[PDB]
Each structure stands twice: as C-alpha cells, then as structure tokens.
C-alpha cells in the first residue's frame, strides 16, 4: 500500500 | 504520501 503516515516519501 | 523514495513535501 501507500498510506499510513500523513507525511512520507513518494509511492 | 507512500513509502519509497523522493520526499512528497519539504
């Protein structure tokens, strides 16, 4: 997936 | 927003 934290790196 | 590399924001 590409979710979990409201700030992160690219997908 | 994902989990790879390259920051989405600064």
Residue-by-residue DSSP string for B1-10: --SSSSBS--
* DSSP secondary structure of chain A: ---SSSS-B--
Cα distances from A5 to residues A9, A10, B2, in angstroms, run 10, 12, 8
Which positions in chain A touch B3 (Cβ < 8 Å)?
1-2, 4, 8-9, 11
Experimental method of this PDB entry? NMR
**CA-based nearest distance A9→chain B, Å:** 4
Phi/psi at B7 (5° precision): -55, 135
- Rounded to whole angstroms, the Cα distance separating A1 from B10 reads 22
């Amino acid at each position: 997936v590409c979710i979990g934290t409201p700030i992160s790196f690219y997908c | 927003g994902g989990a790879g590399h390259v920051p989405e924001y600064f």
